[PDB]
Design a protein around this ligand. Structure first.
Ligand code: 2TM
Ligand code: MG
Ligand code: MG
Ligand code: MG
Ligand code: MG
Ligand code: ZN
Ligand code: ZN
Lengths: 267, 1367, 49
DNA sequence: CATATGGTTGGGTATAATGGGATTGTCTCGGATGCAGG
DNA sequence: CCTGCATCCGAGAGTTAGGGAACCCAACCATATG
């Protein structure tokens, strides 16, 4: 009942894995469905994204909630094309189904990859969901003609999605991706120079070890901007009665003395 | 306009969206470079307002005069920055989410409305099972499916799509069946494969292909990376391709004309579906759902026969319809909201009303409970679908601040992290929906969003609480903010930190008057600083207030004249002194401050008892009432000199203690000598001569001429008190010698000390006759005598003269205690000789009991019990011996005098100091076999010390752990009684209670007159309900019973003239939300009728709660059913040692077997039986008579059973008597009025048994006053009245069931109270004190009462001028 | 006990480094990250009741 | 008003990889509830 | 069908004080300066 990790693991485990034949077939169907959909778009003259969306909506069925009017009208127009063209529509349907089946079958690789990123500011389920997004990207961009296995191309995209999500959402005050990478490089360099030096290095050492364009003031500013905020509800003392925010005075509102001074000054 | 009511109700998505000033679209808080809020973030100035006053973000508009100007370049309105703590935002959820308050508060509102269990609701809301919204003629396992049915994922899919199975085939093994042929269950598809479901079988990835040639065959191998194009059993032509491959050279082109066959399938897919070949364009595409008789292909030549889903396989030019349905089953908050919108409340209400006619009681109760929610929704106007959240409100940023500490670091609230998680998950869900992700991923994301909303609203309720990484601390949700001891209500609304306050250590102030306190100069300067600035401006110390403040800032810049200005500032004003814990109202008192040097507050000795204060490090707080009203209230109502009697018992509370009692007792005691010892003298001259010769002591009780006297009374005869005191000053006689003095026209044989005490009282009260009447001259002055004197002086003269007398007594008691020569030495703990004997006799008898064990006459229990009893009696005898020795040999011993005067000490402690320590308890609770035979003067051994340490530790633990149950009880009583005030002079009732004067004997022998103290506590100050004639004295109706009246009634009762007293009580008052003056009686702190406007509920709660904190079962001494029983009584708890009572009347017949026992109560109509364990003890005998409601065994009576059997008044009497027994056992005096108030609140509600022609439901609990008014209305219109029975509920359940949702929410069970009030749309009318305190209003009590607060005052000149103007 | 907790965390980091890297070019210095051990010691000596 | 610089943000990597990590010394009390008997 | 009977879960448990873990590459709006 509880513990959503167990529920998600069971739901992924209810889908059997794939062999080479099934994987290659699914990749072929997705690719030919994309080719067929662009062929339909060329024949009808409409936007490819819209026909992709209507085909996907008609496949997903009523169960999944552009309104039904446009989807029905364009579908019926699509079901009006003469022969040798509607075949493309059928191939597009099969390709979309193949894409869904491929993602559903390869979801477990996402969990396997994401299970090694815990303790970095994101919960387990968030890492899995971002890995799923990366898996969707890899499925969409995968090219089977190279005879390579799908997981080899999928792992890179899954890792990219997980890393981007960690860089984007792990901090209360958002720091841009390049600055986050700079902080990580600073930390790595400082750690290596700590181990080597047998003591914590001073800022000049880190500045020298980063390379040209780095001085001690820049290192200090970078470590200052890397500070994370503390909680106003941090417990102080053993008893459950004192919080950190209880010791912070308000400096915005004017004090009674200040207001009286202003009123007397106005008078 | 004034605020009079506060309403709480459910919020619609439209209401929430109208609250918001904009939607928060991003989880960003502030920029990492500039520390300004990010656009569309949690701190955006466009949504919540500008950070600076009257200034937009980009600085275009940086001045005022532009109120309401929305910057074109930034979008920031120009207004006060304070709006950042008022303006809300909102988050638009991609999918609806359920408000956890209405899901997890048992019983669930959503579950109760839709008849869904908690497990079923949990399963649906968190995406574990589906719920059907439209069956669409679906069949599951042969049974049609109905609405509101739960399907598992397997059942749902199997029904939505169908059945299929894939069986793999190892290489080299062929399939016995052909592609596209029906296969029945059990039909073997391979030598090691057996199918399970019916339907067509389909080859998957055939390994090899046989292509003939017009004939002769040929084989082609198919690798995994290549597919087959030609359908099974189809001829092929030259140049056509068969096995399409990745490589153009690897493609297989048919050389000649030949048929094609496919063998060695990698797997077989058996599906349950229909087949339909076609030869031209088809009409329905893959993924389409069809019905029977629908067009498939060939322009309608082929038609569908079953419900299912269509796949048009172009390889074999065939449409396959898998048997499925269009069922509309959904999961989650979307489905729950759909069910909620479809609900029609009126029809459901009608179904439940018909359901209320069933003979079953449980079913009827369920229908009533469901109807409660249905009717609450119908009356309030709230829509049920509003319990599902669509737009999440966002708290203003200034209440979830992100502030920079002085060192440049940042501190933030957990709400920011919760909102960030919610926004991130919502955005990811929206992104995933826009990408057409599979349903498993979407289901996971929707579950995560629901959990995020649950954590934001109430973290730590379902599942593991959300914590920040690197810590185990749960994040603090809004529910945590509202509720608890650290929550908003209890920490910031019912109690606050205040200005103009200080604290310091306290020191005794013996030279102070009763109304004065010593305040440090620096503390006073800081406390009265604005007044000092005004006075300094008035004088010439400073030109203006600013310069004065700068002067007072620096210590070295302070001069002499500012102190005189301060002395002028405080003239006539009072301050409030408070010592924690404040157990009763006397924990805060008003005093006139005298400015002193040093840093200690000086406290009057006579208020220390009221404060429970001493001088070993205690600290007290000081507060300054500011306005004229506050000063008048402090000077008139809470001044120390105006509060001399206890509000709980009416006894004096400011009274002599410790040194004062010691000094007065020392001067009022008389010497006794044994030199003469009753000798005989014929003439006084012989006695005088004998005394001069040295044979007779001065104060020896001799007999001369047949009368007892002493040589002192004949030798020394004084004309007046002045002569006796002059002789004392000359050393002729001592204050303790008995002489004869002429005073008040009489010749008194008394000591000069008693005459001096008489002169002290007379000079303090400035009246000789009344003072002579008040004092008891012929007794030593101790605690009780002084208390009686203070009370009598109060009654006869007034508080002002009483305060003067108290001060005089304090001064003279201290003076005479200083010079008395009271000291403690090691020899002052006199050891009696008899103890030695007492010990040897025991060492003798013990041996005998051991002989009693060597011959088998005694068992373990008998020997242990006998040893314990022996040592107990030895300890008692030693105590008596010690005190007899003190009384006979050393009548002035310091310990004896201290205990006898009531100054300090009790007999047990003296016994431990002098006689022996006694038996000790093991940690298991059993006594040891050897006692501690050493006193503290002789010194204990190591083993005895360790043995006593167990009891010492047990006492310490008991104190620390129980004080919180007593505090809890006090809080519960305040919450249940806070609304009761004296609201009128007379309610007009003719009902009353009868106070009894006799009690049944413990052996049922006869009635014995009750103890005087108990009768006093039950009778003093009450209003007589009926006229009384006793001892030729007529007590008229409406007479407040004074102490003399109570004594007269007791004396009349002792003569058999009266047995009971009829009086008014709060139990029978009819005033709404309070009592009346007559039904309450005397204000016990003033000994005069209570004033209208008094908050008597708070006084009652404090009076009950104060003694239990300390004096209940204070330091415990480990030397040889208290509070729990009171808590059990106030909560209407059923006892675990419950007794058995006689429901009816009848005769007793005991039926005894050797294995079982029973008691038959045989009436004239019926005879019932009671089976009880054989070991029990019976209070009745065979052939006895018992009335209804009488007990049949020993033990506590169940109050609910008594209510059912005997009625309401019997339960009120039982509750009052049983609560008073516990307090009497500890020696605490508390008048019955307070307990009666609490019991009246306990017995407030009724339960409907028959609704009659009303809208009420059977079993619906409601207030007795409301149902009485409704019945009166019913009678006026002339219908059938509602039938009800009284209910009894504990204090907690009564307090949580009140009408006011604010007080109940601030008391306890905050989430439940708030959810129920929001569902019902309850309006708080602000009747009680808690609500007005929460809103910061004037409480409707005391000076804020409507009876007194509209009073006007005018002088005669203005009044006559106004009269002339009227004329 | 706190040292053992830190050492277990260090061992986990060593395993991840072993797998994610290159078996041919590996040294003890590259495998061991000592930050968890120092963090555990600091927490014990600064935050333990 | 018109650019020119850094800061910011979106896109990409191809042997193969396929279900996670903690759990522990209170005590009572009251209502909801599933299970057993008659 | 009713009823009672263990069974489970949820909500309580005094005041004041003081205390404190990849890297790279290229396009694109934002802001700064004249
Ligand atoms: N946890 C605690 C501990 C103490 N207190 C308060 O501090 C006092 C210390 O008294 P104490 O223990 O020194 C005995 P005292 O009252 O002076 O009595 P005696 O003269 O008869 O010996 C208690 O009586 C309470 O008012 C509290 O509120 N919570
Ligand atoms: Mg505190
Ligand atoms: Mg004391
Ligand atoms: Mg003290
Ligand atoms: Mg004489
Ligand atoms: Zn602006
Ligand atoms: Zn009344």
């Amino acid at each position: 009942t509880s513990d959503p990790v167990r529920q998600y693991l069971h739901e992924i485990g209810q889908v059997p894995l794939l062999t080479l034949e099934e994987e290659v077939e699914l990749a072929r169907k997705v690719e030919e469905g994309m080719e067929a959909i662009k062929k339909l778009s060329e024949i009808t003259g409409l936007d490819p994204d819209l026909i992709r969306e209507v085909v996907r909506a008609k496949i997903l069925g009523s169960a999944r909630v552009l309104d039904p009017k446009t989807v029905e009208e364009i579908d019926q127009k699509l079901k009006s094309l003469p022969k040798e063209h509607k075949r493309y529509l059928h191939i597009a349907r099969e390709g979309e189904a193949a894409r869904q089946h491929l993602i559903e079958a390869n979801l477990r690789l996402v969990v396997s990859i994401a299970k090694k990123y815990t303790g970095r500011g994101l919960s387990f389920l968030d890492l899995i969901q971002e890995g799923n997004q990366g898996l969707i990207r890899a499925v969409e961009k995968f090219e089977y003609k190279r005879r390579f296995k799908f997981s080899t191309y999928a792992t890179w995209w899954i890792r990219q999605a997980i890393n981007r999500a960690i860089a984007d959402q792990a901090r209360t005050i958002r720091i841009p991706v390049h600055m986050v990478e700079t902080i990580n490089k600073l930390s790595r360099t400082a750690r290596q120079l700590q181990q080597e030096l047998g003591r914590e290095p001073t800022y000049e050492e880190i500045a020298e070890a980063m390379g040209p364009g780095w001085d001690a003031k820049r290192v200090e500013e970078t470590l200052k901007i890397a500070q994370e905020p503390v909680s106003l509800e941090t417990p102080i003392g053993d008893e459950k009665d004192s919080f950190y925010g209880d010791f912070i005075p308000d400096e915005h509102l004017p004090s009674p003395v200040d207001a009286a001074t202003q009123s007397l000054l106005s008078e | 306009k004034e605020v009079r009511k506060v309403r709480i109700a459910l919020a619609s998505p439209e209401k929430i969206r109208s609250w918001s000033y904009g939607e928060v679209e991003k989880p960003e808080t502030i920029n990492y470079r500039t520390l300004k809020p990010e656009r569309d973030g949690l701190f955006d100035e466009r949504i919540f307002g500008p950070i600076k006053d009257y200034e937009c973000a980009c600085g275009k508009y940086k001045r005022q005069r532009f109120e309401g100007k929305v910057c074109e370049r930034c979008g920031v309105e120009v207004t006060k920055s304070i709006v950042r703590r008022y303006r809300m935002g909102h988050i638009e959820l991609a999918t609806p989410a359920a408000h956890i308050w209405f899901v997890k508060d048992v019983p669930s509102k959503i579950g109760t409305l839709l008849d869904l269990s908690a497990t079923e609701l949990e399963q649906v809301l968190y995406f574990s099972k589906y719920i059907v919204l439209d069956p669409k003629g679906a069949i599951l396992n042969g049974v049609p499916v109905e609405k509101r049915q739960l399907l598992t994922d397997e059942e749902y899919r199997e029904l939505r799509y169908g059945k299929q199975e894939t069986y793999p085939l190892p290489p080299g093994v062929d399939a016995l069946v052909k592609d596209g042929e029906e296969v029945v269950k059990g039909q073997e598809l391979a030598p090691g494969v057996v199918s399970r479901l019916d339907g067509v079988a389909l080859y998957r990835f055939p390994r090899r292909v046989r292509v003939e040639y017009v004939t002769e065959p040929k084989d082609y191998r198919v690798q995994p990376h290549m597919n087959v194009v030609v359908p099974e059993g189809a001829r092929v032509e030259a140049g056509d391709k068969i096995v399409a491959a990745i490589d153009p050279e690897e493609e297989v082109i048919a050389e000649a004309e030949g048929v094609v066959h496919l063998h060695e399938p990698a797997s077989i897919l058996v599906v349950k579906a229909r087949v339909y070949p076609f030869e031209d364009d088809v009409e329905v595409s893959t993924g389409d759902r069809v019905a029977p008789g629908d067009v498939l292909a060939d322009g309608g030549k082929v038609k569908s026969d079953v419900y299912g889903r269509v796949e048009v396989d172009l390889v074999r030019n065939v449409v396959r319809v898998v048997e499925s349905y269009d069922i509309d089953a959904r999961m989650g908050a979307e489905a729950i909201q759909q069910l909620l919108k479809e609900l029609d409340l009126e029809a459901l209400e009608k179904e439940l009303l018909e359901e209320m006619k069933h003979p079953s009681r449980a079913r009827r109760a369920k229908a009533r409970k469901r109807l409660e929610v249905v009717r609450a929704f119908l009356d309030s106007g709230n829509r049920p679908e509003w319990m599902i959240l669509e737009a999440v409100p966002v708290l203003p940023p200034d209440l979830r601040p992100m502030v920079q500490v002085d060192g440049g670091r940042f501190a933030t609230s957990d709400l920011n992290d919760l909102y960030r998680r919610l926004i991130n998950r919502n955005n990811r869900l929206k992104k995933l929906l826009a990408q057409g992700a599979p349903e498993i991923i979407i289901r996971n994301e929707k579950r995560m969003l629901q959990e995020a909303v649950d954590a934001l609203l109430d973290n730590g309720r379902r599942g593991a609480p959300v914590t920040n990484p690197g810590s185990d601390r749960p994040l603090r949700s809004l529910t945590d903010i509202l509720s608890g001891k650290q929550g908003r209500f209890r920490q910031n609304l019912l109690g606050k930190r205040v200005d103009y306050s200080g604290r310091s250590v306290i020191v005794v102030g013996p030279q102070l008057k009763l109304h004065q306190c010593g305040l440090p100069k620096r503390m006073a300067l800081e406390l009265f600083k604005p007044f000092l600035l005004k006075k300094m401006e008035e004088k010439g110390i400073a030109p203006n207030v600013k310069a004065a403040r700068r002067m007072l800032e620096r210590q070295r810049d302070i001069k002499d004249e500012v102190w005189d200005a301060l002395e002028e500032v405080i003239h006539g004003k009072v301050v409030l002194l408070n010592r924690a814990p404040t157990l009763h109202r006397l924990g805060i008192q008003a005093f006139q401050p005298v400015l002193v040097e040093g840093q200690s507050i000086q406290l009057h000795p006579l208020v220390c008892e009221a404060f429970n204060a001493d001088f070993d490090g205690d600290q007290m707080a000081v507060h300054v009432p500011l306005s004229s009203f506050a000063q008048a209230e402090a000077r008139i109502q809470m001044l120390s000199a105006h509060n001399l009697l206890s509000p709980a018992s009416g006894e004096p509370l400011a009274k002599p203690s410790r040194d004062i009692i010691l000094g007065l007792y020392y001067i009022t005691q008389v010497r006794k000598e044994k030199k003469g010892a009753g000798l005989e003298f014929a003439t006084p001259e012989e006695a005088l001569a004998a005394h001069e010769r040295g044979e007779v002591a001065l104060n020896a009780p001799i007999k001369v001429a047949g009368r007892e006297t002493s040589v002192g009374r004949l030798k020394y005869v004084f004309a007046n008190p002045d002569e006796a005191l002059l002789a004392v000053a000359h050393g002729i006689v001592d204050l303790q010698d008995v002489v004869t003095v002429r005073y008040m026209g009489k010749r008194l044989e008394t000591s000069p000390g008693r005459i001096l005490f008489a002169r002290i009282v007379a000079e303090a009260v400035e009246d000789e006759k009344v003072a002579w009447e008040l004092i008891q001259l012929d007794v030593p002055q101790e605690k009780n005598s002084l208390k009686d004197l203070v009370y009598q002086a109060f009654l006869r003269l007034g508080m002002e003269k009483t305060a003067r007398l108290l001060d005089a007594l304090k001064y003279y008691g201290f003076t005479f205690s200083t010079t008395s020569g009271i000291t403690i030495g090691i020899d002052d703990a006199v050891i009696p000789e008899e103890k030695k004997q007492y010990l040897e006799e025991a060492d003798r008898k013990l041996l005998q009991i051991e002989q009693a064990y060597e011959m088998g006459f005694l068992t373990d229990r008998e020997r242990y019990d006998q040893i314990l009893q022996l040592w107990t009696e030895t300890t008692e005898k030693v105590t008596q011996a010690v005190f007899k020795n003190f009384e006979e040999n050393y009548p002035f011993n310091p310990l004896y005098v201290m205990a006898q005067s009531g100054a300090r000490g009790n007999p047990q402690q003296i016994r431990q100091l002098c006689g022996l320590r006694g038996l000790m308890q093991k940690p298991s609770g059993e006594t040891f076999e050897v006692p501690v035979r050493s006193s503290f003067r002789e010194g204990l051994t190591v083993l005895e010390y360790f043995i006593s340490s167990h009891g010492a530790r047990k006492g310490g633990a008991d104190t620390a752990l129980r004080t919180a149950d007593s505090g809890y009880l006090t809080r519960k009583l305040v919450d249940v009684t806070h609304e009761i005030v004296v609201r009128e002079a007379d309610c007009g009732t003719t009902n009353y209670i009868s106070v009894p004067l006799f009690q049944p004997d413990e052996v049922t022998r006869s009635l014995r007159l009750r103890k005087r103290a108990d009768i006093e506590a039950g009778l003093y100050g009450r209003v007589l309900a009926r006229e009384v004639e006793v001892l030729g004295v007529r007590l008229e109706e409406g007479r407040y019973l004074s102490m003399d009246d109570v004594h007269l009634l007791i004396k009349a009762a002792e003569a058999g003239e009266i047995q009971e007293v009829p009086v008014r009580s709060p139990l029978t008052c009819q005033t709404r939300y309070g009592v009346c003056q007559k039904c309450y009686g005397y204000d016990l702190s003033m000994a005069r009728p209570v004033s209208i406007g008094e908050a008597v509920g708070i006084v009652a709660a404090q009076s009950i709660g104060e003694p239990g904190t300390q004096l209940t079962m204070r330091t415990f001494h480990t030397g040889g059913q208290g509070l729990p029983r009171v808590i059990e009584l106030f909560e209407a708890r059923r006892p675990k040692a419950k007794a058995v009572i006689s429901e009816i009347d009848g005769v007793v017949r005991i039926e005894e077997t050797e294995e079982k026992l029973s008691v038959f109560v045989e009436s004239e109509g019926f005879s019932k039986e009671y089976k009880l364990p054989k070991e029990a003890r019976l209070l009745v005998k065979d052939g006895d008579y018992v009335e209804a409601g009488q007990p049949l065994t020993r033990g506590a009576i169940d109050p609910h059973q008594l209510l059912e059997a005997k009625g309401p008044e019997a339960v009120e009497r039982y509750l009052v008597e049983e609560i008073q027994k516990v307090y009497r056992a500890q020696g605490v005096k508390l008048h019955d009025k307070h307990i009666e108030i609490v019991v009246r609140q306990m017995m407030k509600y009724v339960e409907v048994t028959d609704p009659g022609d009303s809208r009420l439901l059977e079993g619906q609990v409601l207030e007795k006053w409301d149902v009485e008014a409704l019945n009166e209305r019913l009678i006026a219109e002339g219908k059938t009245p509602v039938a009800w029975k009284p209910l009894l509920m504990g204090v907690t359940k009564s307090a949580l069931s009140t009408k006011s949702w604010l007080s109940a929410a601030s008391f306890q069970n905050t989430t439940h109270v708030l959810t129920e009030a929001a569902i019902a749309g309850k309006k708080d009318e602000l009747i009680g004190l808690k609500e007005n305190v929460i809103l910061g209003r004037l409480i409707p009590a005391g000076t804020g009462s409507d009876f007194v607060r509209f009073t006007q005052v005018v002088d005669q000149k203005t009044l006559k001028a106004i009269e002339e103007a009227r004329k | 006990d706190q040292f053992r907790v830190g050492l277990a965390r260090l061992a986990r980091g060593v395993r991840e480094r072993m797998l994610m890297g290159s078996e041919d070019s590996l040294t003890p210095a590259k495998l061991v990250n000592s930050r968890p051990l120092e963090a555990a010691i600091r927490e014990f000596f600064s935050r333990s009741q």
